[PDB]
Amino acid sequence: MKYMITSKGDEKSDLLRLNMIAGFGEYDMEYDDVEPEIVISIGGDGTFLSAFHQYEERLDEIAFIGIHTGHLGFYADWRPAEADKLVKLLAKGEYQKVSYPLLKTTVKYGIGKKEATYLALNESTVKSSGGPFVVDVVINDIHFERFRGDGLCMSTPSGTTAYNKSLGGALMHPSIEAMQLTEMASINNRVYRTIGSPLVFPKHHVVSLQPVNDKDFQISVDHLSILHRDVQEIRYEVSAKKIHFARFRSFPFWRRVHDSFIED
Amino acid sequence: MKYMITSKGDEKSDLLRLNMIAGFGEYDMEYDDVEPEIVISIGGDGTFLSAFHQYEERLDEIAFIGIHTGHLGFYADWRPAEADKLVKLLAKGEYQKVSYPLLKTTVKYGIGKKEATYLALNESTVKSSGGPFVVDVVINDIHFERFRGDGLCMSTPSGTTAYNKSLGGALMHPSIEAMQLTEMASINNRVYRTIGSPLVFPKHHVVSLQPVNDKDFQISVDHLSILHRDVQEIRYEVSAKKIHFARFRSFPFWRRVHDSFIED
Amino acid sequence: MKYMITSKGDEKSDLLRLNMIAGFGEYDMEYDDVEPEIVISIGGDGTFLSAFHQYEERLDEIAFIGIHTGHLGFYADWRPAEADKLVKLLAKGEYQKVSYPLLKTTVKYGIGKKEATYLALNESTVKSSGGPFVVDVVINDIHFERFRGDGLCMSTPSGTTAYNKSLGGALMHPSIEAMQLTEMASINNRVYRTIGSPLVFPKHHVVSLQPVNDKDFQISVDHLSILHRDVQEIRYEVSAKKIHFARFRSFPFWRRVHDSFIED
Amino acid sequence: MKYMITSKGDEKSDLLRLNMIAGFGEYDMEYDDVEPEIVISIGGDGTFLSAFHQYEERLDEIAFIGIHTGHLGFYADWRPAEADKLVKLLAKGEYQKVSYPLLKTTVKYGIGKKEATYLALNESTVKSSGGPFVVDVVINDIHFERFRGDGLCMSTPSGTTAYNKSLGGALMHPSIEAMQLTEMASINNRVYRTIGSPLVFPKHHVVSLQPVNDKDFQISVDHLSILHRDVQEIRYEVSAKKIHFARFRSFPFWRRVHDSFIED
Numbered sequence A, B, C, D: 001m002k003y004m005i006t007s008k009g010d011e012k013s014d015l016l017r018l019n020m021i022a023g024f025g026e027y028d029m030e031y032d033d034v035e036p037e038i039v040i041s042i043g044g045d046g047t048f049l050s051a052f053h054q055y056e057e058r059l060d061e062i063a064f065i066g067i068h069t070g071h072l073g074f075y076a077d078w079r080p081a082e083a084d085k086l087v088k089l090l091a092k093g094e095y096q097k098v099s100y101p102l103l104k105t106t107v108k109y110g111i112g113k114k115e116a117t118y119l120a121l122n123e124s125t126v127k128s129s130g131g132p133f134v135v136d137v138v139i140n141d142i143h144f145e146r147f148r149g150d151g152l153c154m155s156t157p158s159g160t161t162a163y164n165k166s167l168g169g170a171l172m173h174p175s176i177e178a179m180q181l182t183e184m185a186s187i188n189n190r191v192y193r194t195i196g197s198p199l200v201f202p203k204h205h206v207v208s209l210q211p212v213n214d215k216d217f218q219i220s221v222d223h224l225s226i227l228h229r230d231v232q233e234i235r236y237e238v239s240a241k242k243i244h245f246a247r248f249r250s251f252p253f254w255r256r257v258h259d260s261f262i263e264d
């Protein structure tokens, strides 16, 4: 099948990539980075997020695999010593696919109310450029709170172990089709009030962030920034699209959580 | 239809109950507290939890309604001045029902490994009698962590605004069939380690709490305690049973959250 | 005595300032904004922080008073209706002064290791421009942790009810000569580790923040930014200087806390 | 000098104690557990807290030393392999003493308003027997908040790395004469409100806990419980007494914190 391999870029990852390419050359496997059906990421979770966005337009036709040349990653869940066994089992095929939910981010900007859309595998954040900013939080067209603070983070299930976790959010199993909103240093006194707790939204719920005064701020989607100015709204909802993983053995999410945060 | 009315017990609630009973006497409505199809709770959320457990054996044949004689409740979402309109709309019928997920708690105890089961509308907690206690946390038969601290709380979705919220847990919309585990003052140092973050589990996942040394502690289910000694395991899973609410108008969960924590 | 009055700038504050100036004209009080002995701030805590930095070079010769034209402030603890009584009691004199500790911030920058120093009444923060940044935390010349996250906040006692509070820090009575360091969304996994808890340092302890890779970031002191590039170190210590308040009646810190966060 | 040695009780600690006793027999050192001037604790922090309370009536005449037969402790900061060097340097003398602040707990109980007093090295806690309880919090005779939740914890500086830390409290250097109050799962909604943040009190401030309805609950002082019923008040204040440590080398508090929570 058509495949491609992304590399973190250091000597170790580039070398494993070349050895896997040589291994794939011994089967009916063609290297194609334009229309790959299999995308292998060799590096960390940052390398994997890069591969995801590199092919975010062909998500339904791609199964991702991550190899971690350093420590264990949440998306890179293969050890480099198993690369040959990966090439072998990947060559034959007949593997099962596993799908994780994604986050759709819509940004309304400009005088013409143009709308740009993005997909996030970890999270999308809206953050003040400097100091605190003010944003109205609207849930299914009802005004919920006026947030004053550093920013807000909307995470996917698999993203809950990332930025979301550092903000006090809950860890959610990726079989739950949902999104989680966490606060970044909210102001709470007699006059200003936020819910404080993380909020977990099901499918079809729409969370709208509407900045009040200043209209220029930082919007992130995973490891990058959404470059649009004069923003009037950031809408969040569980995407109808999913990322597909090629799985070859049982590595449960909670064991992955245990291995990455408890002890390995 | 057969109905019954529980009362908080003060003058205000007893009086509204008697007036509603008189109102129901003007329709084809029979008072029956043995096999009611409608259970009306007049009081707070504590009164509502009492009504739930009072009829936890006929949950699939009952639609609950809560009236709050004091402040707004999360389960008591009717104002006393609307009691007549409630009797009227309840008398005719044709209302829609809304179902919230529940939590199944199984307690393995004794030499014979007997198993008692309970249903929780808010949460079930395992807490040390005095000082900290030690419990092994097993998720789908894999050991996840050894918890050392004051206790653990497993909450339903509608329970996430209760004990769960005070422990730092996330607020989950009740359409999500899940349960959330939060820690109570865990010890974390070089030797002892817990995940710290709240954990959200989907259906069919089983969380097993297995106390290590001391085998006598406090188990709660909502507002009461499970009285069984020589405990060997407390198993948590999303129940296959649901609580059914009779709804007569739109009162969304997030507006209920806003009204109870932000401002009303 | 020589005095001056700063104004928030809206109609209400400018008007009270002009009326107080007219009131002071009836006593041996001279308006002098170059060498004032009394500085009156009419507005919010933001107006008061402006007045503090406007005269941060003559702190030992000035007693500050704050009037809040809106809600109660932590530094503006006079109501506008008491402005006449303030002018009267201020005119006579014989009032007691109250001193709060301050925070000294030293920034080492450039090839020549130049050092600029600043005083903070609330806090000084070091924050990443975009995404997370890495800083080594050195306490009294011993390496304590390598912080990876959004930033760090070092607060004075009176500042603990401000940014520090939103970051989970403790509220400290201003009679305690100390500073408190809080984290902003630290990364914590198997590889990366911070203390997590807020840290409270006594006098003469020096906390040094030494950025690891990127050397360009945002340094704040109260409501403004310290504009120096090529930073090599940010040193924190309790200042030997103090801010002096003119007090005319008992308004204890904890009652001020109660009035601003509990209920007023 | 007169000395005594407490032991955790396992084979390793009892054996080191007997070897140190034999070592002390070679100097002008007399074993006396009635009036010791030096108290050596061999075990963990639990063993050290036992030794502290065992001699809490002669604190001003005793210098404590802790040896940790297992992992490093915050009070047991000597390794067992250095026991001979400890006996040797302790035999000569001329060591410096280091003093940490303590917490005075006064319990008013009974019809006669009797008052029992206790000293805490780590903390004193007031906790509900079952479910949540209600206590009024009075600071210097002014009512600050009505706490509804699981309990409250008042910690010494050296205690801030213990129960206080697990409750979100700040870590305070023991040179700061203060006490810190942290909440245990407080209820916060539209009707019920607490400060939420930890509170740090200087010397001479008195925090009074006055239970509202139920008058029977659990009071702890370090590892034990204060057995008095019909309680009307629990008063907290920084004690005028201090615990004295015999120090033989520099082991700074922050390095001790780093070694116990970051990495060792």
Ligand SMILES: [N]C1=N[C]=NC2=C1N=[C]N2[C]1O[C]([C]N([C][C][C][N]C(=O)[C][C]N=N=[N])[C]C#CC2=NC3=C([N])N=[C]N=C3N2[C]2O[C]([C][O])[C]([O])[C]2[O])[C]([O])[C]1[O]
Binding pocket: A044, A045, A046, A049, A073, A074, A075, A122, A123, A158, A159, A160, A161, A162, A163, A164, A166, A222, A223, C131, C132, C133, C134, C148, C149, C150, C184, C185, C186, C187, C189
């Ligand atoms: N504050 C905070 N906190 C927390 N978190 C966070 C923050 N911010 C941000 N964040 C994240 O991040 C991501 C991105 N990136 C890249 C870039 C950045 N970075 C760098 O720099 C490095 C160094 N550091 N420093 N300084 C990529 C990634 C990733 C991931 N993912 C995940 C999941 N899912 N789970 C779990 N884990 C995880 N991870 C991790 O994380 C870290 C960082 O990464 C590392 O380990 C990795 O493995 C965004 O997305 C957000 O989330």
Ligand SMILES: [N]C1=N[C]=NC2=C1N=[C]N2[C]1O[C]([C]N([C][C][C][N]C(=O)[C][C]N=N=[N])[C]C#CC2=NC3=C([N])N=[C]N=C3N2[C]2O[C]([C][O])[C]([O])[C]2[O])[C]([O])[C]1[O]
Binding pocket: B044, B045, B046, B049, B073, B074, B075, B122, B123, B158, B159, B160, B161, B162, B163, B164, B166, B222, B223, D131, D132, D133, D134, D148, D149, D150, D184, D185, D186, D187, D189
């Ligand atoms: N710590 C903590 N925190 C938090 N929380 C908690 C705690 N513990 C417990 N808890 C809860 O609680 C419940 C039970 N109870 C009764 C009994 C007890 N109580 C009493 O006493 C009173 C007084 N107080 N004091 N002191 C009933 C109920 C309920 C409910 N539910 C809900 C939901 N769902 N959401 C929201 N909210 C809510 N609620 C609320 O809550 C509170 C208390 O209630 C009140 O307001 C009410 O409305 C158990 O279940 C747990 O959850």
Ligand SMILES: [N]C1=N[C]=NC2=C1N=[C]N2[C]1O[C]([C]N([C][C][C][N]C(=O)[C][C]N=N=[N])[C]C#CC2=NC3=C([N])N=[C]N=C3N2[C]2O[C]([C][O])[C]([O])[C]2[O])[C]([O])[C]1[O]
Binding pocket: A131, A132, A133, A134, A148, A149, A150, A184, A185, A186, A187, A189, C044, C045, C046, C049, C073, C074, C075, C122, C123, C158, C159, C160, C161, C162, C163, C164, C166, C222, C223
């Ligand atoms: N995230 C976060 N959180 C928290 N916090 C914070 C933050 N960031 C920052 N911060 C603060 O701030 C300050 C400054 N500023 C001005 C500027 C900014 N601002 C604006 O925009 C407005 C709107 N908002 N929004 N969006 C001034 C001031 C002040 C103060 N001070 C105090 C004390 N001491 N205590 C208590 N409270 C207080 N305060 C308050 O606070 C708020 C804000 O202000 C208000 O209410 C006032 O009264 C810096 O310093 C930091 O601290």
Ligand SMILES: [N]C1=N[C]=NC2=C1N=[C]N2[C]1O[C]([C]N([C][C][C][N]C(=O)[C][C]N=N=[N])[C]C#CC2=NC3=C([N])N=[C]N=C3N2[C]2O[C]([C][O])[C]([O])[C]2[O])[C]([O])[C]1[O]
Binding pocket: B131, B132, B133, B134, B148, B149, B150, B184, B185, B186, B187, B189, D044, D045, D046, D049, D073, D074, D075, D122, D123, D158, D159, D160, D161, D162, D163, D164, D166, D222, D223
């Ligand atoms: N929740 C929570 N959390 C936290 N914490 C706490 C709690 N509760 C309580 N606590 C503590 O504690 C103590 C007492 N104890 C004994 C008894 C109990 N115990 C047992 O069991 C064992 C097993 N476990 N489990 N389960 C003794 C001691 C101590 C101490 N001290 C200190 C300082 N200062 N710093 C730092 N660290 C420390 N420590 C530690 O801690 C842990 C526990 O110990 C161990 O590692 C030790 O080394 C009371 O006092 C309170 O604090």
